[PDB]
Scaffold this active site. Structure first.
Site, PDB file in Angstrom:
ATOM      1  N   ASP A   1       0.729 -62.260  76.540  1.00 48.17           N
ATOM      2  CA  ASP A   1       0.570 -62.026  75.105  1.00 48.17           C
ATOM      3  C   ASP A   1       0.390 -63.393  74.466  1.00 48.17           C
ATOM      4  OD1 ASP A   1       2.677 -60.454  72.499  1.00 48.17           O
ATOM      5  OD2 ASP A   1       0.560 -60.995  72.559  1.00 48.17           O
TER       6      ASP A   1
ATOM      7  N   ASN B   1       2.802 -66.200  69.214  1.00 50.31           N
ATOM      8  CA  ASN B   1       3.838 -66.536  70.185  1.00 50.31           C
ATOM      9  C   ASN B   1       3.808 -67.988  70.641  1.00 50.31           C
ATOM     10  OD1 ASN B   1       5.036 -63.848  70.514  1.00 50.31           O
ATOM     11  ND2 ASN B   1       3.054 -63.307  71.426  1.00 50.31           N
TER      12      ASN B   1
ATOM     13  N   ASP C   1       8.386 -66.072  74.285  1.00 55.35           N
ATOM     14  CA  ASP C   1       8.239 -64.655  74.576  1.00 55.35           C
ATOM     15  C   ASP C   1       7.393 -64.321  75.801  1.00 55.35           C
ATOM     16  OD1 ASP C   1       8.468 -61.919  74.276  1.00 55.35           O
ATOM     17  OD2 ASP C   1       8.104 -61.969  72.100  1.00 55.35           O
TER      18      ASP C   1
END
Length: 325
Positions: A198, A203, A214
């Protein structure tokens, strides 16, 4: 397939942090993250921390261990990420019916995808990340593919209930058409490795250097996965950023230019999965609280049109004149 939201009082958490000698200090102030419940807390020396309670039913212990390993190893090879703290044995604590880990509150400012320099620093560390990530593959965590991203969601969509009746047909049609297009361009003709999964501005933090946060989504997939969501701007701006982050990235990991063809399918993939993702977590108060529209037609009409539009991006436009450059 849909989660049965189980609440977690901030008190039940203090017990957890107690049962593991994790002395707190003052207040367990909550941070906002949709996927899992994260709370911050100082230590006896006032050095900020955060507890992350992995939402039940999502990942298994064997799966959270795989990222904890990845994160820990990644730290070893000098890659800007915060590994979970160990507590007299492992890092994956578990109080009551919830698993959890504690991470060193990182801190830092908001990463600017604008600044081409930070882009390079991020692309470069991303190259060292994938350098590590390629050493071995997850065994329990998912490995990006059509099953989890396309076919499963389409199955949920069928018996949805949350999709306005008679508008669903057109929608399910636009979906099928989309998964047919992405499938036709998908390929097992690429290299797979442990990814951040992601990787997009959100992030990533910056305190004189990039810091990735994360890894909850870390999955096995194509290197491009952690690169396409970075591009921003007009076509030509993205032509140079891509060109730029790869030049930095290649310092530690060679990039296979051909993977650039997998981007529209990945975006299509993230698009359709995200709808099931929201849907599956609907019993969680937080989702109808932030995505109220998920219920109206407007939203499902726009989505239908977005899907139809994506399939066109995946296919050559009948322009024909074929204007080169």
């Amino acid at each position: 397939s849909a989660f049965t939201f189980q609440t977690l009082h901030p008190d039940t958490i203090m017990d957890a942090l107690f049962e593991h000698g994790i002395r707190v200090d003052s207040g367990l102030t909550p941070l906002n993250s949709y996927e899992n419940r994260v709370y911050q807390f100082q230590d006896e020396d006032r050095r900020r921390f955060v507890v992350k309670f992995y939402r039940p039913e999502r990942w298994t212990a064997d799966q959270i261990l795989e990222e904890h390993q990845f994160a820990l190893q990644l730290v070893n090879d000098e890659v800007p990420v915060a590994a979970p703290v160990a507590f007299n044995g492992q890092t994956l604590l578990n109080h009551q019916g919830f698993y959890f880990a504690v991470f060193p509150s990182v801190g830092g400012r908001q990463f600017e995808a604008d600044n081409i320099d930070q882009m390079e620093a991020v692309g470069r560390y991303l190259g060292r990340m994938h350098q590590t990530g390629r050493k071995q593959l997850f065994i329990h965590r998912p490995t990006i593919g059509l099953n989890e991203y396309l076919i499963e969601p389409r199955k949920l969509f069928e018996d949805a209930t949350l999709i306005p009746s008679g508008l669903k047909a057109a929608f399910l049609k636009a979906t099928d058409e989309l998964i047919a297009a992405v499938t036709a361009h998908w390929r097992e003709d690429f290299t797979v490795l442990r990814l951040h999964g992601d990787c997009h501005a959100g992030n990533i933090l910056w305190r004189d250097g990039p810091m990735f946060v994360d890894l909850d989504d870390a999955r096995n997939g194509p290197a491009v996965q952690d690169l396409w969501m970075l591009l921003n701007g007009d076509k030509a701006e993205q032509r140079m950023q891509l060109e730029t982050i790869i030049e930095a990235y290649e310092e530690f990991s060679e990039f296979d230019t051909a993977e650039i063809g997998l981007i529209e399918p990945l975006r299509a993939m993230r698009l359709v999965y995200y709808l099931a993702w929201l849907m599956r977590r609907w019993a969680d108060p937080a989702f109808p609280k932030n995505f109220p529209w998920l219920t109206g037609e407007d939203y499902w009409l726009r989505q239908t049109a977005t899907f139809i539009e994506q399939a066109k991006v995946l296919q050559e436009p009948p322009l024909q004149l074929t204007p080169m450059y």
